[PDB]
Symmetry: C3
């Protein structure tokens, strides 16, 4: 690893993923990243509810880091003095020392640099895990995805090549916002004051909200995902704490690695797939119809009532072969 | 599609499935179906609890529609003037326009006809999804299965032929019945009056009941499923809203497509499989022993306390090789 | 079966598994086991909470029984007169008579002997299932694993041999301990007195505790699992009632049968896998780094708050290639 070339990557905010190659002729590199932790109060719904949040790089989820199998990930993790809590990082893509958590314990005003070999292909959760407060830091927003692509790109069950033309990254967050005796959500002046009440809600195992990328409606309106008929999209879906069941309304998972590990053959033609709490999964879909799709958790209560739903706006020409309105709604004859 | 022969299918009520071929020499057809929506109050347990229900064809689940890969499904959806709500249909087996929901919005007194290409094999959920009230219509009973068989029938992982001699369809429904201050379930005079209280219960994510085919004990007693030793049964299991884990007590899933998509290899020898909320799965089993089996959700609280369990009564000759009582219960020597 | 040699196996307490061969030259045998039911009050957490528990062989989970495909399992099940309840056993690995439950109904002071053919490879749940009180007996602790190894040992997806050097068995138990009006957990003088209040908690679907092997911290401290760099461990994980998502922190599932059935190809490189309620799954991992790992349910609330977490202490030499601390935590420059 000390023999290898280094490259530095500039991360981009979700739902985008930083530019990268799929299949590559390049040999292994030490790939350098930096992330800066930001604790902040965030508004998470349409009625002004707040979360005392904790983030990698100021976003929920943290940005997606992309490397190739055999690369080394070298992350500089910075915890500014403006934060109140200690933090670290646990990469599910890494081997040893609790995913790196034991080697990256950073108090406010500190930083650390971790290297690990990305020797396994797939999408992998990374998350903060400070001793004694692991679930709180995770549910407050400290998670994201490391994608380790096979050096020769994605493959179908027969070993045929697969690709995407655009990648989107979706972090789904089960949130545990306490209420006061009046039945309204509590607003806390500081992160520390949210702790005890939040642990109580967590223990009920019932989320108050479940959101994609930090807020109800985050991936809707001006912020909807986009694509065009004929384009293949990769949808990366991470859930660091709780199970979810992604579904594309009007579409499918053409090829899905629901457990998120690319050396395994994908399943095809899925209506709904399953992302285990503590994992990231990946689905490919090639659009065949224009229009606005929903991409959601298909516990429809969790989607429509709690917030786990987004939109994809797709340009192109309608295909009557695939679907046709034979008779529009009209009075019963 | 406008070049193809049409066939008309008469649907049958669950747990049966309408007559159909598995492997077929027939070429693609436009296959015509009709369904009529019925809103109605239904008794869902042994103590007289009622649900303000919403159904396709008067049953929970709606009937199963069976076609072959490459067929076109052409459904006439009728919403009689006797109903209070608008409805539509979203086929997970279809491509575009939110599964067809955008093209089938029917007010009471209206009907519509949708065609789509069944270009993907598997069992697929269909459900109502009216804008702004999706989860309510789904949990109140508006879902069923479309089965798209491969034109050459089912195949094992080695591409060997598989078949069933009888098919049963099981819709599992997580119900959200409100209680009054006395702790008894509420009875509502109309469907609209159930709405607000039901949304409140839904948001708790805790079902009051979880039932197969519309009621506790629906598939028991005179209404138990039946088979004989040597017969292979297909068990189609749909859950449009919530995860379930089917299990056959005293049996197995000989071949299971838990994600329900037939172009993927099935798993064998399963004790319990997993149906993701928002999907239908399929299991084959060949009976080897006579007797009464239970078929249930193996969260045993959900099965025995909440209602997610049925029976299969199986005729035939007992096999001592497979199982033998060496010593009957007797005092400890 | 009446032609075959008999062998008698002495069971060992979890987390160990009794000595056995993987690949074997031996032909089919009738393999004889005995288990004795013990009802007892157990302390399940650090603050003195008790469970009115029910066990096979005095442990949660019951011991793991290991045979080979084609063997016959012959179990003598003893219910001493010191117990208050009737019991039986349902083997998911068996065919007929509700898994054997119908043939093993034992009142206190009775015993029975059941034989069945272990004709399917995999890890399979066994559990008590007395008519009318199935979920209570299961959640109070009456479950364990039967492992049926293929006669030629484990195989990867290409049919290559796989093995483990040490096997551990983990039973995960969702517990439903009632509270009194003071908010403290209730202590019951007898098993029967716990029943009504416990059913009420069960029906909420919210566990008060979720524990590995009978208690918070059961697999920690002096009781941590152990291994060494270079050693391959099999981790058997059973959950007879509720879904879980195992994860090894700092490690992976090198080869995983999450549905637990060895005739299916395993998945590789898993971060987190899924054990369906009512099943046992199996994961292989070869340690590459020394240190203390956590093995946990990756709903991190369920793990850290409710108790579903253990430790593995691993001896050996650190590998800087796999992971290196480039810069230790230090002030931001
Ligand atoms: Cu943190
Ligand atoms: Cu983790
Ligand atoms: Cu409707
Ligand atoms: Cu849907
Ligand atoms: Cu028992
Ligand atoms: Cu069972
Ligand atoms: Zn204050
Ligand atoms: Zn009224
Ligand atoms: Zn008493």
């Amino acid at each position: 690893a000390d023999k290898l070339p280094h490259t530095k990557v500039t991360l981009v905010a979700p739902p985008q993923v930083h530019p990268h190659e799929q299949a590559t002729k390049s040999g292994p590199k030490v790939v350098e990243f930096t992330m800066t932790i930001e604790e902040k109060k965030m508004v998470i719904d349409d009625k002004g509810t707040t979360l005392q949040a904790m983030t990698f790089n100021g976003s929920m989820p943290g940005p997606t880091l992309v490397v190739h199998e055999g690369d080394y990930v070298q992350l500089t993790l910075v915890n500014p003095a403006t934060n109140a809590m200690p933090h670290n990082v646990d990469f599910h893509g890494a081997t040893g020392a609790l995913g790196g958590a034991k080697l990256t314990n950073v108090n406010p005003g500190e930083q650390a640099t971790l290297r690990f070999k990305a020797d396994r292909s797939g999408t992998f959760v990374y998350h903060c895990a400070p001793e004694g407060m692991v679930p709180w830091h995770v549910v407050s927003g400290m998670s994201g995805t490391l994608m380790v692509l096979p050096r020769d790109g994605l493959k179908d069950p027969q070993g045929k090549p697969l690709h995407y033309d655009r990648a989107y990254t979706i972090g789904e967050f089960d949130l545990y916002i306490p209420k006061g005796p009046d039945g309204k959500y509590k607003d806390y002046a500081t992160l520390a004051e949210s702790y005890g009440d939040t642990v109580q809600v967590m223990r009920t195992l019932t989320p108050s909200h479940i959101v994609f990328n930090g807020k109800v409606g985050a991936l809707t309106g001006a912020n909807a995902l986009t694509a065009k008929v004929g384009e293949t999209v990769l949808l990366i879906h991470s859930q660091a704490n709780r199970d979810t069941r992604p579904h594309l309304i009007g579409g499918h998972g053409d090829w899905v690695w629901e457990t998120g590990k690319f050396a395994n053959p994908p399943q095809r033609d899925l209506e709904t797939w399953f992302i285990r709490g503590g994992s990231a999964g990946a689905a490919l879909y090639t659009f065949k119809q224009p229009g606005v799709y929903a991409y959601l958790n298909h516990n429809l209560i969790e989607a429509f009532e709690l917030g786990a739903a987004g939109h994809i706006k797709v340009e192109g020409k309608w295909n009557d072969d695939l679907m046709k309105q034979i008779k529009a709604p009209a009075p019963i004859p």
